[PDB]
Every structure is written in C-alpha cells, then in structure tokens.
Write a protein that binds this ligand. Structure first.
Ligand SMILES: [Mg+2]
Ligand SMILES: [Zn+2]
Ligand SMILES: [Zn+2]
Ligand SMILES: [Zn+2]
Lengths: 61, 263, 45, 67, 49, 113, 56, 147, 48, 57
RNA sequence: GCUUGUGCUGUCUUCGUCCA
C-alpha cells in the first residue's frame, strides 16, 4: 500500500470508528484547542457549543 | 545421657529444652536445621506467555520462594545424581500455572493455589504448594488486568539452603542459654545499675536466680539450652528436628567411612 | 512474515519489508515487534 | 512493587498476609494491633508489611500492550 | 522561519546560550539533560540555580 | 561475572579428596587433617568432643578464608593412643549421642501429641 | 484483512465462496458486486471489527 | 575501612535486587537521491566488512525480537550501506560485494534479555528503530551502599 | 565448522542439567554454551 | 604523592571482582573501601620482575 | 562435496566518582 491509500483506509475506519480511547482523548484535546481559539477571539456563541459538546463527550469513569 | 523436654508443640513451631549436651552440639544442630535439611523448591521456570506488568525474572524469583510440600523428599534423588535424560519423575516435580483476566474491568489476583501438579514421583507426598487451610488462597504471585495472561511451567527440584535460601525449611531459630548469666559469658553494659537496666529473659523463671552470698563457680559449663524452631510449612517442626539429627549423623558417618577407607 | 503490534490499539499484523511503517486500522506511526518463539527459561533464583 | 514472599531477615512467609492486613485496617484496627493479629512478632517481619508500598496498582492503570 | 526555529533548537539542545557561529565566547551549560535516576534527583534538578 | 557457583560449597570434585592427613613432625604423635567441603558445623562439634578426652592433649581448627569451603584440624594425643583412633572414637560417640537424643525427642513428641 | 482495499470491489466480483444460508445447509453464491452501506456497521470477527462493506 | 557485611540469605530473598534497562538507537541515513541505508540481515557474500559477532539472532527485517538472550558484541540491529561495486563484474555469480556493514553490536561488557523493540519513522521519513535490553543486578562484593 | 554452532542446545548431565543454551564456540569437544538465564558462558564436553 | 604510593605485591587469584589488600597497607596508599579504585601493572620481563621483587616490594 | 567471515572516528560541552 501507498501512503495515500493507507491514510484513506484510516480515514474510512475513523468514519466507521464508534469510539476508541486514544481517539477520544485526541478529539477532546482538539476541541480544547478550538475552545481556547474561540475564547481568545471573544466569540461567546461558539464557545457555548464547544462546552456543550465537551460535556456530552466527557464524564468518564 | 542427653535429655529432651518439650514446652510447646505445634505443626509449624516447637519450643523445647535440651539438657546434658555440649554447646557445640546444640549450635551444630541449629546450623544443620537452618542450612542443610533438604526440601523441595521450584528451580526451573519455562515461560510460554507473560503479558503482565512484571518482568519474567521477577516472577521466576517469586516462584522460587514458594514453599512446597517436602514430606517424602528423602526418597527423591538429586538432579545431578539422576542418570535419566533431562528431568524424570524420580528427580523432579512439574507444576503448571495458567492465569487470565476475563472481562474488560477489574483486576485478577494470581495466587499460589493456582499452581497445579502435573507429574511427580508415584505415591510420594511431594510437590503440592503448602496451604494453611482448605479455604486459604496462599501467596500472592501477580496481578492481571484485561487481556493480560500468565502461562508458565515450573520444575521443582531437591536442594539445601547452602545453595540458595529458597530451600530452607526454617525461618528463624531462637536459641538461648543461661538466662541469669551465672557463667559470666556476657558483660552487661550499664549507666547506673546493670540489674535494672536490662530486661529479664523469658526463661528467667525456669532457673533459680543466684544467691547474693554465692561466689562465682568456675567449674560450671552451659548445660541447658532453650530453642524454638519455626518452619515455613514445607516440613513439620518434629520432621525438621529429626532430619537435622539424621543429616548430622550422616555427615559424621561419612567422615568415619573416609577415615576407615584411608587405610 | 514478521509479526508486529500497534502502539495505540494493540492490533496485530505483518509487514513484507515494502509497506510504510504504520498501523493498518488506526494509522499510528509507532509499532512494536512481537515476542519470539524460541524457548525461554529462567533459574528461579 | 508487590508484597515480598519472604521476610528479608529471617525468611518467614509474609506474602499471604497482605489482603488480611488491608482488611484489618479497613475494620478500624491500628497497624500495630493488625500486625499482632496476623502473628508477626519479630520486628523484622513487622517492617516488611508496615513499610511496603504497593506500586503494582499504579503500573496496572496503563493500558495493556498486547491483546 | 528556519532562523528562529534552528536558533532556539540549537541553544536548547547544546546549552550554548547564543548564536551558533558565536559559540566561542558564549555562556554554556544554561540547558542540561534532565536527571531521571530517581524522583528526588529530578526535583532537585528542576529547582537548581 | 567472577562469582563462583553456589554448589561448590558442598559438592566434592572428582579429583579432590574429602580428607587428607599429614603428620606434624614438630611435636610427637600429631597429625594435620584437611577437610574439604566442610565448615564450622562439623569442625566445632568434632573439636569440642575431642577436647574432653583424657588422652587428647591438643585439638584445634581454623577456617583459613571464608570464601573457600574447607578447614584444617590439628590433633595431638598421648603416646599410647593414635590421633586417628581418637578421631574415630569421637565420631562414633557423637553419633551415639545424636541417636539417643532423637529417640528421646520422638518419645516426648509422641507423649505430648 | 483485505475488504478496505479500493481494488477489493473488483477482486471480489465474480468469486465463488461458501455462504451460510441461515434458513443450515451451506451453499455457493456468485458475487454480482459490492455496495457500501453507511450506518450499517456490523461486527465482522470481534467487537472492534466494525465493517461497512456489503456483498451483493 | 567503611566496608560492610551483608547477609547472603537476605540477598537470596530479594534484598536490594534491582532491574537495569538500556536502550540502543539506529536509523537509516540519506546520502543521496538513491543512496539509502537499509535494515537487513547481512550476508558474507553480498556484504563487505562484517564484524566478529554473531548474526543468527537477527530476523528477516534485520532486527532482533524481544525475549532473546544477548551477549556482548552480538549484533542486535543489522544495517548495510551501498557501495559502488569493484571489478568483481569479471564474474562472481552471487558473491560480489555491493554493500558495507554498519550494524550495531551489543556493548562488550553487557549481556541480558531483549525487552522491547520499537519501529517507527523519523521526521525526514526514513526508518527508525529502538531496542531495549533488560537485566537484573544482584548485590555482590564491591557494590556501593549508603545511609 | 561444526553443524552445532548457533543452535539451541540442552544440557543432559552434570551440574547444569536441563538448562537451555546456545552453542557459541566449538573447537575440540569442549563446546562453549551460553546459558539463557545466568549471564555467563560455560565450557562443556559434547557428550553432555 | 610519594614512592610508597607504588609498591610491588604478590598475586593471589580469587573470586569476585574486587582487588583485595591487607589493611595495614591502606595507610601508605591513603585508601579506604568506600568506592576507591586502584591500578595494577604487570611486568613483562625477567629483569623487570627482578627489579619489582627486589626494589619496590 | 561441503567448509567461517576478522574491526573504529574526531572535537567540544555538561554531569558525576575517589583524594585533596
Ligand atoms: Mg574513599
Ligand atoms: Zn531423573
Ligand atoms: Zn493501531
Ligand atoms: Zn522476619
């Protein structure tokens, strides 16, 4: 397989990925980065949606 | 002439008093029971899979220290004295442990009761790991979480504590004589008064304290020796005492045989 | 011919000395070799 | 890391008393009283159980490397 | 961007706190490999002057 | 790397005798015995048994180095007796003492059980 | 091992394989093609082995 | 003189026993447009300038596997670099050298068990390996202790 | 060259009975075998 | 510091990985057993061995 | 008929060990 084919297969399985701990941590980190970008831009509307999404994804055990 | 008196008796400990024996004889008996009574212990570990958080040699060392039943180990042979190819049923005992955690949550403990005897000498009571009761779980060996498995095959061989301390049948042998210090074998350090700065021995009531007007007796020798033998469970206390006596007799008989053969 | 294991999702696969060093399913860039098949023995001391 | 099988000084088997020790401490017994209940008389054996740190519980929190 | 990137990376990697060509007659040892032999040694190395 | 095998403390090599006896010509009727793969356990027992015999005038032992498992005994007896005979008598006497000690221990254990 | 390959659609086309009838006497079927069905993820071999490929 | 006596039975039961880990690193360097180092098992026919250690513990990919015993000088990472062939095109059917050996041996004073082998790619894009060796060190005469 | 170099071997007699090893040096009958757990190499006759 | 820092000894081959000294020679060497190390030099000739055994012993 | 291969960088920097 080539690099592009491997990345396409990985993206396809990520679309198929219901949940995976490493991927959930990475998504939560990316959401936190997006949240700090929205906070630093004084966007009071986007940050509420990101907080709600983080609350839905979070609350681990 | 030698006399034995037993104070307390149990499966794993006996407290006795030896009288009319030399100090050297009692000390040699203590040393023999500590270092020269043969037992059975795991010596070779074949690891087929180990995905735990513990290193392989860590688990092997822990396995070596597990006490096994060694009642009939006198009928077994030493591995280097056995003419067999590899290991046979007359010089080794084979045990097998297979552990795994099922489920995606929680932790599983691996105990010494999970060791299963697969082969060994026919009709000899050797090989099984020691257990205090029927419901006792034994010694904690490892801990496993999900998708972690341990699968090993151990070989138990006969040996003595001179080669490695895992073969020692005893843990600690208390040993004591002359609680009132009539022989003056020790000189007591003190600040004000030696009598009231030193605790009394636990056998101080077994001997008459010296009279205030008595003078030092230079003809006396140590005569009564108090000793407690504690075992790890691999052997009973009386078995350890008898086999220590037998081992000392065998060593002396070997010396005598070498002397007579020297001619 | 040689087995590997992913550093993230612990998935097993094989490589033929021509594929990129990557996990098949999650695309991690870190993989580990599998344990050998030779006999392993210790002296329990 | 994990409770030693034998006492270092004398070799008494102390590796079968860790869970009972934790149980006794749970019930509210003092550490000295709990060690007395487990029949650990010599202070060499009491040191083994009193000063042990269970590090395997921290090592087990990392995800397994093989499945 | 390679100027700032390489300068910061070189200074932190080697400990010479200056330009790479100006390494001679420049302060050295400002950056060191973290000690990891034991936890207390790591703490001590992180609180050193 | 330089650690000797632990079984060398008690396993006797094929070419190494268990017992080597040489005379000590400085004083009359004295021998030097070299014990291989033995230690204080046998040495102290034999020495303090022999020291109580009327016909034994000198008995001693020393372990030259703790890293080597051997000891050397010096034994001197009266004109009538030979030192080797005294050593054999000492071995037999300790064996008899251990035998009666074991008998009495078994008797007392059976009584108390 | 090979369902996610882009060429697997043409590879599996026309192949003959043993199929579980379910209604079980196994029979042979001819693959007329494949069609991805989104939202129809199913366990293939284990719980984590999610697959969306379907064989017509 | 500040020496101490330690109990051998305590040492046998696990007093001051410790674990030792050492890691080795190697990667494929880029010298030209098509000149690349390769991780592989060298052969005395195709490769020149081999070492005195053994090569039988390597796998097909040139890397040792975890769980294998390693002694000093043994080869744990097999790497070769290409070399412009000599006049051996005079006829050497399968035994003309085109590679030079650049393998990584184990330290001569060390031995142990291979604990973990890591394979990945570097920032540039070539292969990158890390091998960790594990051994146990038991206290002995000449080891340093302090209160 | 002996056909036993770099091959897994087991010891059947002596003080190292039943230990797995690998043959490293073989000149005249005295095979040099490294032991898997003890980090050492020992001489041994080919008979064992 | 002085010529008693180099002296000629007689070899005794022993197990374990340390050099072993009588404790009375620790004063001229100014040595103790808390981690010190010492060097050893082997003569390679009969004349050199005689020099060591008759002058530096 | 089949035969075993024969070696290693340099220059700085830092942290340490035993004396002093
Ligand atoms: Mg010093
Ligand atoms: Zn046998
Ligand atoms: Zn993965
Ligand atoms: Zn204790």
């Amino acid at each position: 397989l080539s690099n592009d084919e491997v990345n396409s297969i990985v993206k396809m399985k990520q679309s198929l990925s219901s949940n995976t701990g490493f991927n959930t941590v990475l998504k939560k980190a990316q959401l936190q980065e997006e949240l700090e970008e929205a906070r630093d831009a004084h966007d009071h509307e986007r940050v509420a949606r990101i907080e709600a999404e983080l609350k839905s994804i979070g609350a681990e055990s | 002439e030698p006399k034995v008196n037993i104070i307390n008796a149990q499966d794993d400990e006996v407290e006795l008093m030896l009288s009319d024996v030399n100090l050297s004889l009692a000390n040699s008996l203590r040393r023999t029971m500590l270092a020269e009574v043969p037992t059975l212990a795991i010596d070779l570990v074949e690891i087929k899979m180990n995905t735990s958080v513990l290193a392989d040699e860590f688990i092997s060392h822990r396995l070596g220290l597990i006490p096994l039943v060694s009642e009939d180990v006198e009928e077994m042979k030493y591995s280097r004295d056995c003419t067999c190819e590899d290991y046979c049923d007359e010089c080794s005992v084979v045990l097998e442990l297979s552990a795994r955690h099922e489920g995606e949550e929680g932790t599983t403990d691996v105990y010494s009761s999970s060791l299963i005897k697969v082969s060994g000498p026919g009709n000899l009571n050797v090989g099984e790991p020691v257990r205090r009761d029927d419901y006792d779980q034994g010694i904690l060996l490892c801990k496993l979480r999900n998708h972690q498995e341990l699968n090993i095959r151990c070989i138990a061989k006969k040996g003595i504590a001179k080669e490695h301390a895992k073969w020692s049948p005893c843990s600690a042998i208390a040993f004591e004589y002359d609680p009132h210090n009539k022989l003056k074998h020790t000189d007591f350090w003190f600040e004000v008064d030696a009598k009231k700065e030193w605790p009394d021995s636990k056998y101080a009531t077994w001997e008459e304290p010296p009279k205030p007007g008595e003078v030092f007796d230079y003809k006396a020798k140590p005569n009564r020796f108090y000793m407690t033998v504690e075992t790890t469970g691999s052997l009973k206390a009386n078995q350890v005492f008898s086999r220590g006596i037998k081992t000392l007799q065998e060593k002396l008989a070997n010396v005598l045989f070498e002397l007579e053969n020297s001619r | 011919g040689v087995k590997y294991t992913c550093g993230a999702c612990a998935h097993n696969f094989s490589l033929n000395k021509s594929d990129p060093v990557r996990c098949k399913e999650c695309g991690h860039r870190v993989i580990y070799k599998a344990r050998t098949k030779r006999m392993i023995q210790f002296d329990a001391r | 890391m994990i409770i030693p099988v034998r006492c270092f000084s004398c070799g008494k088997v102390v590796g079968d008393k860790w869970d009972a020790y934790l149980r006794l401490l749970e019930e509210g017994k003092q550490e000295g009283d709990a060690l007395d209940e487990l029949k650990l008389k010599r202070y060499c054996c009491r040191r083994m159980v009193l000063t042990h740190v269970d590090l395997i519980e921290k090592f087990l929190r990392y995800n397994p490397l093989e499945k | 961007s390679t100027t700032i990137t390489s300068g910061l990376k070189y200074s932190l990697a080697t400990g010479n706190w200056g330009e790479q060509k100006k390494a001679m007659s420049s302060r050295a040892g400002v950056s060191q490999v973290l000690n990891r032999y034991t936890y207390s040694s790591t703490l001590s190395h992180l609180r050193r002057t | 790397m330089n650690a000797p095998d632990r079984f060398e403390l008690f396993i006797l090599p094929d070419d190494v005798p268990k017992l080597k006896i040489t005379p000590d010509s400085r004083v009359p009727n004295c021998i030097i015995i070299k014990f291989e793969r033995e230690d204080h356990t046998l040495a102290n027992l034999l020495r303090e048994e022999l020291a109580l015999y009327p016909d034994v005038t000198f008995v001693a032992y020393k372990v030259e180095h703790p890293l080597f498992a051997n000891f050397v005994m010096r034994l001197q007896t009266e004109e009538g007796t030979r030192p080797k005979q005294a050593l054999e008598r000492a071995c037999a006497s300790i064996i008899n003492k251990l035998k009666t000690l074991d008998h009495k221990f078994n008797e007392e254990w059976n009584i108390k059980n | 091992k090979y369902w996610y390959y882009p060429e697997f659609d043409d590879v599996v086309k026309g192949m003959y394989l043993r199929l579980n009838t379910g209604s079980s006497p196994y029979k042979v079927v001819e693959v007329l093609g494949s069609q991805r069905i989104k939202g129809s993820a199913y366990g293939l071999n284990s719980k984590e082995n999610n697959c969306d490929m379907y064989l017509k | 003189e500040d020496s101490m006596i330690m109990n051998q039975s305590s040492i046998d039961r696990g007093l001051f026993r410790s674990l030792f880990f050492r890691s080795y690193m190697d990667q494929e360097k880029r010298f030209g447009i098509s000149i690349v180092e390769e991780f592989e098992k060298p052969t005395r026919a195709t490769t020149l300038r081999l070492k005195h250690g053994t090569y039988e513990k390597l796998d097909e990919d040139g890397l040792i596997a975890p769980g294998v015993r390693v002694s000093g000088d043994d080869i744990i990472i097999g790497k070769t670099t290409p070399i412009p062939p000599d006049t051996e095109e005079l006829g050497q059917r399968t035994k003309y050298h085109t590679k030079r050996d650049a393998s990584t041996p184990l330290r001569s004073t060390e031995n142990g068990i291979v604990d973990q082998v890591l394979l990945t790619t570097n920032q540039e894009g070539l292969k990158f390996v890390k091998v960790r060796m594990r051994t146990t060190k038991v206290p002995q005469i000449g080891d340093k202790f302090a209160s | 060259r002996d056909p036993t170099l770099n091959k897994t071997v087991k010891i059947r007699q002596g003080g190292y009975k039943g230990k797995i090893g690998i043959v490293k040096e073989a000149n005249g009958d005295r095979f040099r075998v490294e032991l898997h757990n003890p980090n050492k190499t020992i001489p041994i006759p080919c008979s064992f | 510091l002085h010529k008693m820092s180099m002296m000629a000894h007689r070899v005794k081959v022993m197990p374990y990985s340390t050099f072993r000294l009588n404790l009375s020679v620790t004063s001229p060497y100014n040595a103790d057993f808390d981690g010190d190390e010492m060097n050893l030099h082997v003569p390679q000739s009969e004349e050199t061995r005689a020099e060591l055994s008759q002058l530096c012993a």
